[PDB]
């Protein structure tokens, strides 16, 4: 028999960025698993003013935002023939310059916000911390030990969005063989917390606590083993600026007419991103669902550049968990058209048009940062100068069984035994290391 | 040793919507699994007449379809400046008004037609039904206890389409780091029974019968424990109206010219859906494959609105199996172009154009209908006031092992014990309940 009863925070009215404490009572003869339930409140940004044409202001991450004059390039210094600049919303709705309280930035969340929240978890018994991990071991366990059959539920618990499928009308096709057919197109979309929205509704997070006795139902420690009043759980919640972020709410639209034959019209866009103020997020219904039952051979290593988590990274919310060097590939789809006004000379079109989209399509590409890895010991060399992909791909693929999933990132490595990690690197910069020694 | 014998229907020439009976013979010392094989015949619609401009007729689900006059809105009463209405096919091929036998509607199937066919299965031994389940337990079984690796075969057996992946030519990209590259685009398409087609080829369906002894090879009941002539299998096949549906074969094209500067041209579409007659579908090669071998702790609960299966639902064929409140999101992609005819004043384009597609892109979004669920007991409260996502997501994720998959619908809940289901909703309407008590 098991009953899920609740425990209240001992500190009282937690806040985002300060220590939080739970006191474990002895209700059942054993306790099996720990789940923390939190409800983050609503979010939005503050109103801002529209700029005046010709203005340059200091944006975020040391970037200069500008609203160029007519006949000049994006730097407001280099002449251009026929450029004209106006202001628009992210959806194409116009804005008049100089208007007070004219627009708001959009707000979105981090990826897997339920994993960044618990930056540090400690289990204390009158001091003498029995166990302690960070928000890096959790990334390793989700990249390795989660079956993947049960990933939809996990992505629902930690507030990560999932894509929804849709279809189009029937379409005609011409088959070839060495004929006609009717087929449908399939598209995907997203609507979760990570999509930039004007107003973010409250977010419910369930976070599981992973101690060595919580892995199996037969290994859970009793509640009578150690005196009653000494059990405590301490958690260091992450700050607000490491959870939510802003997306531009104003864009500058450039229209350029190029004279000649064919005469051409080009329309392009550029963000005007000036940071605003996001209201304080309040945690409510902070509960711990303690469960009361009633009566080495593996190492995962993650090497993460410090650029991933630095506050100066414009994409730290996306890349805070990736183990590798992340670059971005940008595609900009365009609508093109050509028109001829007469039938005298028609070799070249009389007019052309190229219409862009307000925001581009961005693909994050992760690349390895390690060429050779060696984990030596005082006895012998053990692993010595093995290639990266041998540890990254082949070892999970062969060993492990159905428990260990093959990871996706090039920086997550696995080595089998039955402690000095050195590596050869073509990447210049600091490198963080995360370890997790488990036996199966 | 094992071979599959065939059993013929006892009733004789089944039809869609009538009882069907098999008589189990004693051929081997045991029978393990039973599969019903059916072959539904071809389908198509009847020829119809094209309308006359200005006509209004009552369509399906009490909706009024109209063919407006020139200079009027979609209601044929409100004036509009320059609207012009013509008739087209779903693929843009024109149709002349008033033509006799000018078009046909398209026909498609339900989703998972192999599961809706067996609306009721009974195992009789001179009466005294040993087991009986509906077409709702099967949906829970597929949403919970199917591994996921074996879903391609299952979707092939019950006649559910699977998407096919294609690629495009090489394209140029510009990389950014804090360079050029060649990449490809990946698309998906469908061609199965659920795609509206003029002519639907015959569909072969294999349906597995699930009784308590069919789960394991060691638990199959013998064929001698019960007298020979008393064994019977009864199946109530679903009607033809609950299996196939129609899609419009005629569309009304509206073209509007808006005068001024820029002068604008807009093209939009609206269906003209008037129901027709679908011929009778005949079952052939109706066989039962009996295997002849030769010598509580879980509950799945589904909360389904009655709107999902109601005959007045325009989308009942899509949503007959979804456990939740289903809404629809519509995207309408558009081709846009702007052209300037001269170089005197070029601030604004001289002409614009926006072209729409004939059919939109529809995304089905499912939302929960339960806020709190409690399954009380005569002795104690048992589960009391737990949130919906605790039972929908966390319980499958933690308990179950590799057998239980985490579901995708917000209305499918699972609770563990080692019978009065009440709930709190913000939804007004009738709610259906399905249960399946299993032990593992």
């Amino acid at each position, epitope marked *: 028999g098991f009953e899920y009863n609740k425990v209240r925070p001992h500190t009282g009215t937690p806040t985002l960025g300060n220590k939080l404490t739970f006191g474990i009572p002895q209700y059942g003869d054993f306790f099996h698993d720990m789940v923390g339930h939190h409800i983050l409140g609503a979010c939005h940004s503050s109103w801002q003013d529209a700029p*005046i*044409q*010709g*203005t340059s202001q200091m944006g975020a991450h040391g970037q200069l935002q500008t609203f160029p*004059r*007519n*006949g*000049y390039d994006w730097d407001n*210094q280099t*002449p251009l*023939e*026929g*450029a*004209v600049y*106006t202001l628009v919303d992210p959806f194409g709705r*116009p804005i*008049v*310059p*100089g208007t007070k309280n004219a627009y708001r930035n959009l707000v979105y969340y981090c990826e897997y916000p339920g994993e960044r929240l618990y930056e540090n978890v400690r289990f204390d018994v009158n001091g003498n911390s029995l166990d302690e991990y960070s928000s890096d071991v959790t990334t390793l366990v989700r990249k390795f030990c989660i079956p993947g059959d049960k990933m939809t539920g996990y992505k629902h618990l930690v507030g990560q969005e999932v894509s929804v499928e849709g279809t189009s009308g029937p379409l005609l096709c011409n088959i070839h063989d060495l004929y006609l057919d009717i087929r449908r197109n399939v598209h995907y979309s997203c609507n979760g917390p990570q999509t930039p929205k004007y107003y973010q509704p409250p977010l419910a997070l369930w976070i599981k606590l992973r101690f060595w006795f919580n892995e199996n139902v037969n290994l859970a420690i009793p509640s009578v083993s150690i005196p009653f009043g000494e059990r405590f759980i301490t958690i260091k919640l992450a700050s607000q600026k490491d959870l939510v972020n802003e997306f531009p709410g104003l864009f500058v639209r450039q229209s350029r007419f190029i*004279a000649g034959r064919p005469s051409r019209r080009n329309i392009r866009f550029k963000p005007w991103f000036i940071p605003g103020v996001i209201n304080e997020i309040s945690l409510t219904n902070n509960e711990l669902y303690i469960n009361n039952l009633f009566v080495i051979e593996y190492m995962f290593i993650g090497l993460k550049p410090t650029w991933n988590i630095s506050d100066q990274n414009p994409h730290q919310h996306r890349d805070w968990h990736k183990f590798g060097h992340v670059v971005n590939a940008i595609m900009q789809p365009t609508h093109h058209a050509e028109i001829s006004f007469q039938d005298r000379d028609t070799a070249l079109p009389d007019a052309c048009s190229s219409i862009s989209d307000i925001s581009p399509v961005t693909y994050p590409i992760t690349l390895p940062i390690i060429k050779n890895i060696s984990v030596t010991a005082h006895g012998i060399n053990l692993i010595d100068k093995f290639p990266s992909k041998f540890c990254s791909s082949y070892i999970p693929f062969h060993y492990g069984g159905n428990a260990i999933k093959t990871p996706d990132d090039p920086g997550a490595m696995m080595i089998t035994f039955a402690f000095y990690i050195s590596w050869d690197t073509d990447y210049v910069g600091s490198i963080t290391t995360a370890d997790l020694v488990v036996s199966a | 040793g094992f071979e599959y014998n065939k059993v013929r229907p006892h009733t004789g020439t089944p039809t869609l919507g009538n009882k069907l009976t098999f008589g189990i013979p004693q051929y081997g010392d045991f029978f393990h699994d039973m599969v019903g094989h059916h072959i539904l015949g071809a389908c198509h619609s009847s020829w119809q007449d094209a309308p006359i401009q200005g006509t209004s007729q009552m369509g399906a689900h009490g909706q009024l379809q109209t063919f407006p006059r020139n200079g009027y809105d979609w209601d044929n009463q409100t004036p509009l400046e320059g609207a012009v209405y013509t008739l087209v096919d779903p693929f843009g091929r024109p149709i002349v008004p008033g033509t006799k036998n000018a078009y046909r509607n398209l026909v498609y199937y339900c989703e998972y037609p192999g599961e809706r066919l067996y609306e009721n299965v009974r195992f009789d031994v001179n009466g005294n039904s040993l087991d009986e389940y509906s077409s709702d337990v099967t949906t829970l079984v597929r949403k919970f206890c199917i591994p996921g690796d074996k879903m391609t075969g299952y979707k092939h057996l019950v006649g559910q389409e699977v998407s096919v992946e294609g690629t495009s030519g090489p394209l140029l990209c510009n990389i950014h780091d804090l360079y050029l590259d060649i990449r490809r685009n990946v698309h998906y398409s469908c061609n199965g029974p659920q795609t509206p087609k003029y002519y639907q080829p015959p569909l072969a369906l294999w349906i597995k019968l699930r009784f308590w002894f069919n789960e394991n090879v060691n638990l199959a009941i013998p064929s001698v424990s019960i007298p020979f002539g008393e064994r019977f299998i009864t199946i109530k096949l679903a009607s033809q109206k609950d299996l196939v549906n129609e899609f419009p074969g005629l569309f009304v094209r509206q073209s509007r010219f808006i005068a001024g500067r820029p002068s604008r041209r807009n093209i939009r579409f609206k269906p003209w859906f008037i129901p027709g007659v679908i011929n009778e579908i005949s079952l052939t090669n109706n066989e039962l494959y009996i295997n002849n071998l030769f010598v509580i702790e879980y509950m799945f609960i589904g909360l389904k609105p009655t709107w999902n299966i109601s005959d007045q639902n325009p989308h009942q064929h899509r949503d007959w199996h979804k456990f939740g409140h289903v809404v629809n999101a519509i995207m309408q992609p558009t081709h846009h172009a702007e052209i300037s005819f001269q170089d*005197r*004043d*070029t*601030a*604004l384009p001289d002409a614009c154009s926006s072209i729409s597609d004939i059919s939109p892109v529809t995304y089905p979004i499912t939302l929960p209908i339960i806020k709190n669920i409690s399954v009380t007991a005569h002795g104690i409260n048992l589960i009391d006031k737990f949130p919906s996502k605790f039972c929908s997501s966390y319980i499958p994720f933690h308990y179950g092992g590799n057998a239980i998959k985490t579901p995708d619908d917000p209305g499918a809940m699972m609770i563990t014990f080692a019978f009065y289901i009440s709930w709190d909703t913000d939804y007004v309407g009738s709610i259906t309940t399905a249960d399946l008590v299993v032990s593992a």
Partner: antibody
Amino acid sequence: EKLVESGGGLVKPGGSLKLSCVGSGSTFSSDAVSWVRQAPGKGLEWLAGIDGDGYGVSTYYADSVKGRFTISRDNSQKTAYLQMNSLRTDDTARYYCAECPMVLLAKCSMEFWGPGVEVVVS
Amino acid sequence: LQTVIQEPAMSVSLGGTVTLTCAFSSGSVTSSNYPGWFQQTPGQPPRLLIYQTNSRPTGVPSRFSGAISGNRAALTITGAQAEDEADYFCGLWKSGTDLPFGGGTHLTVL
């Protein structure tokens, strides 16, 4: 981007006059035009101005000339017109155009100037 | 009334540094008034030197600077030359539909 003024000359008191300003730029239709005047021996005084295409076009006026002056645009011929009614003896001055590199006229720049035409009222 | 005042005349030695000032009658000049500075060589149309209190259009030397000092608008010329002998005007954008100019200050380079 240059400007040429025309239509200025001696006007009998109580009459009306029209001044034309011709531009030869690549963005004249997207630029805000304005009219400024300078009495002999005094400082510049701003009179009227119009917006550019891209938003709702509107005309703004000062307080000493509202109701007597009217500013109009013609993008097809690249021209701006000022019509002055009921000229008084205290309007003998020199009138310049001023085209900013901006669409709206509120808080403008007024970079480019024309040579101007000497209008006399007597 | 909101009227614009500045010094009637100033003087400077060749190669020196001289600062001209511009102010309202009662209010306080801030960066939201977007002051502009104009130069008018006699017999010539006015030429724009400083717009938005800091920016220079192309073709203007870097020896001209502009700023807001306390509640005043200041234009600083460092390293004066012979050609700088001219009149200077300050134009302030009060409200959104008024641009009252200044009296005009003659600069004398001895």
